[PDB]
């Protein structure tokens, strides 16, 4: 069923994730502290998001084939996908108890009001929670989770991509691996239904990306807000 190459890819992506997602959340103590300013949570959550961008870059570099892309295409894929992979990877800390992101302590536990205290409105947050709930209900194995993140990043339809055919070839291999993994665990029609819902999630992420971009542009236009961001966030999310 799963070929040696497909097992290889999954092993590599699982290891990449283990090396770039820290489930102890130990580094959160190095951020500017959460304060519960109208945007009182923006220092803390800008540091968290900027840290997460760094981890997404570290994950992306280990995706088989990502190295074969030009530096230009690597940059455009990361710039376009960073926000989506952040939304996807944050689902590992999301909890269905109170619809919040629980990072090991009450100080580092974030609800809808915390996200609104970083500047976003329910225009973004309501669909983001709906997204997190629906992804949680898929009950993905870690193997599917890491494949979805990689498929998310290596998408040939990102604006700016120069070698779309190469990007597509890389993504096709990942997509074939994920489809085969699903088939190994689930007979039809459940296999097709599950893959279909994972594809819908990637489409949802594009809409969330667009809405985040709109709200980020309006927020970062005020210098009193940009002042609270990090240099890495300004570079990656700007432009």
């Amino acid at each position: 069923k799963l070929s040696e190459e497909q097992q290889h890819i999954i092993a590599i992506l699982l290891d990449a994730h283990h090396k770039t997602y820290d489930p102890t959340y130990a580094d959160f103590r190095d951020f500017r502290p959460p304060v519960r300013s109208p945007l009182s949570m923006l220092p803390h959550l800008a540091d968290l998001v900027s840290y997460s961008i760094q981890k997404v870059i570290g994950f992306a570099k280990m995706i088989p084939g990502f190295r074969d892309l030009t530096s230009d295409d690597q940059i455009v894929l990361l710039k376009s996908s960073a926000i989506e992979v952040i939304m996807l990877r944050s689902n590992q800390s999301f909890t269905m108890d109170d619809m919040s992101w629980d990072c090991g302590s009450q100080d580092y536990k974030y609800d809808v009001t915390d996200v609104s205290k970083a500047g976003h409105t329910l225009e973004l947050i309501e669909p983001l929670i709906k997204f997190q709930v629906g992804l949680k209900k898929l009950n993905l194995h870690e193997e599917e989770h890491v494949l979805l993140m990689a498929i998310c990043i290596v998408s040939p339809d990102r604006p700016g991509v120069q070698d779309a055919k190469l990007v597509e070839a890389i993504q096709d291999r990942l997509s074939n691996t994920l489809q085969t993994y699903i088939r190994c665990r689930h007979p039809p029609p459940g296999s097709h239904q599950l893959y279909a819902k994972m594809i819908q999630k990637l489409a949802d992420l594009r809409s969330l990306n667009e809405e985040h971009s709109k709200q980020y542009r309006s927020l970062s236009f005020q210098p009193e807000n940009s002042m609270k961001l990090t240099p890495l966030v300004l570079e990656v999310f700007g432009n």
């Binding site: 760094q54 870059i57 570290g58 570099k61 530096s71 690597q74 940059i75 990361l78 710039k79 240099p231 890495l232 570079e235 990656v236 700007g238 432009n239």
Partner: peptide, 12 residues
């Protein structure tokens, strides 16, 4: 634009 920070993180 250029992206020296992202590029630097890509070259690690």
């Amino acid at each position: 634009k250029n992206h020296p920070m992202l590029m630097n993180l890509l070259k690690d």
